[PDB]
Tab-separated table of C-alpha atoms and ligand atoms in Angstrom:
chain	number	residue	atom	x	y	z
A	4	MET	CA	-21.321	7.903	-16.404
A	5	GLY	CA	-20.123	4.553	-14.962
A	6	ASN	CA	-18.889	3.106	-11.759
A	7	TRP	CA	-15.068	3.841	-11.046
A	8	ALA	CA	-12.513	1.962	-9.187
A	9	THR	CA	-11.651	3.684	-6.196
A	10	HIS	CA	-8.617	3.184	-3.872
A	11	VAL	CA	-7.218	5.205	-0.803
A	12	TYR	CA	-3.497	4.969	0.038
A	13	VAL	CA	-0.458	6.578	1.487
A	14	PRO	CA	1.940	7.287	-1.305
A	15	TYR	CA	5.662	6.118	-0.751
A	16	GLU	CA	8.409	8.231	-2.338
A	17	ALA	CA	10.410	6.250	-4.541
A	18	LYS	CA	13.819	7.987	-3.786
A	19	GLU	CA	16.979	6.791	-5.578
A	20	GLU	CA	18.285	5.234	-2.523
A	21	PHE	CA	15.298	3.044	-2.151
A	22	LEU	CA	15.173	2.147	-5.916
A	23	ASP	CA	18.926	1.230	-5.506
A	24	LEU	CA	17.919	-1.171	-2.796
A	25	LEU	CA	15.467	-2.759	-4.944
A	26	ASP	CA	18.193	-3.037	-7.727
A	27	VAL	CA	19.727	-5.453	-5.353
A	28	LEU	CA	16.759	-7.118	-3.672
A	29	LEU	CA	14.468	-7.759	-6.730
A	30	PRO	CA	17.128	-9.564	-8.964
A	31	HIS	CA	17.785	-11.957	-6.072
A	32	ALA	CA	14.034	-12.771	-5.719
A	33	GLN	CA	14.074	-13.268	-9.503
A	34	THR	CA	16.710	-16.092	-9.144
A	35	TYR	CA	13.746	-17.951	-7.517
A	36	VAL	CA	10.901	-16.559	-9.474
A	37	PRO	CA	12.013	-14.801	-12.868
A	38	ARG	CA	8.484	-13.682	-13.830
A	39	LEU	CA	8.390	-11.093	-10.919
A	40	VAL	CA	7.742	-7.683	-12.166
A	41	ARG	CA	8.920	-4.349	-10.233
A	42	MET	CA	6.213	-1.992	-8.888
A	43	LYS	CA	6.434	1.357	-10.741
A	44	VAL	CA	4.825	3.342	-7.902
A	45	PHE	CA	4.632	2.377	-4.300
A	46	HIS	CA	1.875	2.688	-1.874
A	47	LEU	CA	0.345	1.583	1.476
A	48	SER	CA	-3.288	0.777	1.211
A	49	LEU	CA	-5.788	2.190	3.524
A	50	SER	CA	-8.958	0.944	1.763
A	51	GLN	CA	-10.087	-1.988	-0.385
A	52	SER	CA	-10.413	-1.284	-4.131
A	53	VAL	CA	-14.180	-0.557	-4.408
A	54	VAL	CA	-16.535	0.673	-7.150
A	55	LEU	CA	-18.089	4.118	-6.807
A	56	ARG	CA	-20.603	5.748	-8.898
A	57	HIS	CA	-19.236	8.673	-10.857
A	58	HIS	CA	-21.190	11.603	-9.385
A	59	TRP	CA	-19.970	10.585	-5.909
A	60	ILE	CA	-16.269	10.836	-6.816
A	61	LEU	CA	-15.714	14.412	-6.044
A	62	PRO	CA	-17.919	14.446	-2.823
A	63	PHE	CA	-16.096	11.286	-1.633
A	64	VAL	CA	-12.669	12.880	-2.198
A	65	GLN	CA	-13.847	16.077	-0.428
A	66	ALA	CA	-15.111	13.916	2.640
A	67	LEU	CA	-11.625	12.358	2.723
A	68	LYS	CA	-9.982	15.764	2.531
A	69	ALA	CA	-11.981	16.945	5.535
A	70	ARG	CA	-10.753	14.101	7.696
A	71	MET	CA	-7.361	13.673	6.518
A	72	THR	CA	-6.328	17.330	6.854
A	73	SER	CA	-6.786	17.139	10.806
A	74	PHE	CA	-4.846	14.014	10.981
A	75	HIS	CA	-1.338	14.197	12.357
A	76	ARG	CA	1.643	12.991	10.391
A	77	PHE	CA	3.768	10.098	11.854
A	78	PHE	CA	6.692	7.842	11.255
A	79	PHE	CA	6.572	4.255	10.402
A	80	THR	CA	8.977	1.489	9.810
A	81	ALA	CA	8.709	-0.937	6.887
A	82	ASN	CA	11.546	-3.255	6.872
A	83	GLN	CA	10.140	-6.772	7.308
A	84	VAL	CA	9.880	-8.907	4.090
A	85	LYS	CA	6.683	-10.763	3.507
A	86	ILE	CA	5.109	-12.824	0.848
A	87	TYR	CA	1.433	-12.635	0.238
A	88	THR	CA	-1.274	-12.996	-2.344
A	89	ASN	CA	-4.540	-11.375	-3.294
A	90	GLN	CA	-7.783	-12.868	-2.146
A	91	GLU	CA	-8.028	-15.196	-4.936
A	92	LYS	CA	-4.267	-16.342	-5.039
A	93	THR	CA	-4.066	-15.391	-8.739
A	94	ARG	CA	-1.157	-12.897	-7.824
A	95	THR	CA	1.830	-13.017	-5.626
A	96	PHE	CA	3.606	-10.088	-3.845
A	97	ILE	CA	6.823	-9.462	-2.229
A	98	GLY	CA	6.366	-6.545	0.292
A	99	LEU	CA	7.750	-4.688	3.248
A	100	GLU	CA	5.459	-5.005	6.132
A	101	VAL	CA	4.873	-2.109	8.673
A	102	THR	CA	5.780	-2.811	12.252
A	103	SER	CA	6.354	0.691	14.144
A	104	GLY	CA	3.502	2.736	13.076
A	105	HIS	CA	1.020	0.092	12.401
A	106	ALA	CA	-1.353	1.474	15.193
A	107	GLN	CA	-1.166	4.922	13.652
A	108	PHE	CA	-2.135	3.310	10.186
A	109	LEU	CA	-5.189	1.715	12.017
A	110	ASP	CA	-6.185	5.018	13.050
A	111	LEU	CA	-6.082	6.360	9.456
A	112	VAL	CA	-8.021	3.384	8.343
A	113	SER	CA	-10.571	4.253	10.960
A	114	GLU	CA	-11.092	7.624	9.395
A	115	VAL	CA	-11.094	6.170	5.892
A	116	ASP	CA	-13.518	3.380	6.942
A	117	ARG	CA	-16.000	6.119	8.189
A	118	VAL	CA	-15.973	7.762	4.600
A	119	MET	CA	-16.418	4.409	3.194
A	120	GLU	CA	-19.529	3.701	5.214
A	121	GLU	CA	-20.902	7.188	4.300
A	122	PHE	CA	-20.826	6.150	0.732
A	123	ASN	CA	-22.032	2.727	1.261
A	124	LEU	CA	-18.696	1.121	0.413
A	125	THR	CA	-16.609	-1.971	1.829
A	126	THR	CA	-14.627	-1.061	4.983
A	127	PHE	CA	-11.035	-2.402	5.272
A	128	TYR	CA	-9.749	-5.878	5.605
A	129	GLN	CA	-10.316	-7.633	8.911
A	130	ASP	CA	-6.926	-8.093	10.460
A	131	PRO	CA	-5.011	-5.868	8.316
A	132	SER	CA	-1.470	-5.909	7.428
A	133	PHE	CA	-0.111	-2.745	5.996
A	134	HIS	CA	2.619	-3.222	3.454
A	135	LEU	CA	4.613	-1.617	0.762
A	136	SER	CA	4.579	-3.964	-2.260
A	137	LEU	CA	7.730	-4.022	-4.318
A	138	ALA	CA	7.092	-6.743	-7.066
A	139	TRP	CA	4.360	-9.045	-8.091
A	140	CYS	CA	3.696	-12.107	-10.243
A	141	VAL	CA	0.757	-14.051	-11.722
A	142	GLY	CA	-0.122	-17.080	-10.039
A	143	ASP	CA	0.678	-18.438	-6.338
A	144	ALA	CA	4.423	-18.427	-5.884
A	145	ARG	CA	4.374	-18.570	-2.054
A	146	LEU	CA	6.042	-22.059	-2.173
A	147	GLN	CA	9.025	-20.701	-4.138
A	148	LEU	CA	9.335	-17.380	-2.376
A	149	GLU	CA	8.907	-18.322	1.240
A	150	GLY	CA	11.704	-20.204	3.102
A	151	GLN	CA	15.265	-19.767	1.974
A	152	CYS	CA	14.393	-16.992	-0.546
A	153	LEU	CA	12.490	-14.951	1.999
A	154	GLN	CA	15.397	-15.364	4.405
A	155	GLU	CA	18.008	-14.043	2.128
A	156	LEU	CA	15.677	-11.005	1.085
A	157	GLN	CA	15.424	-10.368	4.802
A	158	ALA	CA	19.249	-10.451	5.054
A	159	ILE	CA	19.652	-8.035	2.302
A	160	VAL	CA	17.402	-5.523	3.874
A	161	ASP	CA	19.076	-6.023	7.429
A	162	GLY	CA	22.311	-5.249	5.793
A	163	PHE	CA	21.258	-1.930	4.549
A	167	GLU	CA	15.759	5.712	7.384
A	168	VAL	CA	14.724	5.008	3.881
A	169	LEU	CA	12.866	2.025	5.725
A	170	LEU	CA	13.251	2.644	9.496
A	171	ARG	CA	11.796	5.856	9.737
A	172	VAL	CA	9.287	6.812	6.941
A	173	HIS	CA	7.340	10.086	7.569
A	174	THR	CA	3.734	9.888	6.310
A	175	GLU	CA	2.966	13.230	4.568
A	176	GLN	CA	0.047	12.735	2.153
A	177	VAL	CA	-2.925	10.482	1.475
A	178	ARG	CA	-4.110	9.926	-2.189
A	179	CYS	CA	-7.219	8.559	-3.749
A	180	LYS	CA	-7.258	6.992	-7.155
A	181	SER	CA	-10.497	6.900	-8.842
A	182	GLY	CA	-10.414	5.440	-12.449
A	183	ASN	CA	-7.582	7.374	-14.139
A	184	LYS	CA	-8.038	10.332	-11.716
A	185	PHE	CA	-5.712	10.927	-8.711
A	186	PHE	CA	-6.550	13.242	-5.713
A	187	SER	CA	-3.942	14.319	-3.174
A	188	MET	CA	-4.234	15.763	0.347
A	189	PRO	CA	-1.767	16.719	2.875
A	190	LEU	CA	-1.841	15.310	6.513
A	191	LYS	CA	-1.502	18.032	9.395
B	201	U5P	O1	-4.658	-6.099	5.238
B	201	U5P	C1	-4.517	-6.543	3.906
B	201	U5P	C2	-3.736	-5.943	3.083
B	201	U5P	C3	-3.605	-6.192	1.855
B	201	U5P	N1	-4.191	-7.408	1.430
B	201	U5P	C4	-4.120	-8.037	-0.069
B	201	U5P	O2	-2.856	-7.533	-0.583
B	201	U5P	C5	-3.148	-7.044	-1.903
B	201	U5P	C6	-1.960	-6.187	-2.335
B	201	U5P	O3	-2.020	-5.062	-1.244
B	201	U5P	P1	-1.428	-3.538	-1.454
B	201	U5P	O4	-0.048	-3.661	-1.257
B	201	U5P	O5	-1.970	-3.219	-2.946
B	201	U5P	O6	-2.284	-2.792	-0.519
B	201	U5P	C7	-4.422	-6.318	-1.811
B	201	U5P	O7	-5.013	-5.949	-3.090
B	201	U5P	C8	-5.226	-7.332	-1.012
B	201	U5P	O8	-5.722	-8.502	-1.794
B	201	U5P	C9	-5.067	-8.130	2.341
B	201	U5P	O9	-5.725	-9.333	1.937
B	201	U5P	N2	-5.123	-7.657	3.639
B	202	CL	CL1	8.845	-17.725	-13.458
């Protein structure tokens, strides 16, 4: 039956224009940290990765659908490069932090958090920072990526919509190997 890894997020469309930007940005970051790996799919988290008993997957998804489908779509900006780690500092990420639209993400998280509480699951991180992860590596590479590298990554981005005005259209829940989609209003 089992308990399934469950995660709620906004998917981010990997358009050619965005992937072409990564074609310039990520090799530059790899001159500092070659073992960075490009993300294959792109998302902005709305929940922690939690564990949910199997028989509650479908009811959890339906609860999310009910809430999300009355939530209005919005625009956001994600053009600020940031280095961050996972909680245990065994992985490092290069991401794009949301500026404009952060408050609307907080409102989405409020709704997701209520579903988490309904199913006795962990609510979102205190002091959250919404971001689109672009690449990751094992270990804590903050010392190598922050400073000169980060300034040059920011310069590449500043030199490039795609990032300025992204429209949220859907919310998705991954549970184990299952992916459940829903439209915003
Ligand atoms: O507000 C946040 C957002 C993300 N993370 C960390 O950043 C990792 C990568 O985030 P994501 O881009 O997968 O959401 C997460 O798994 C989590 O460890 C936080 O600590 N706080
Ligand atoms: Cl390396």
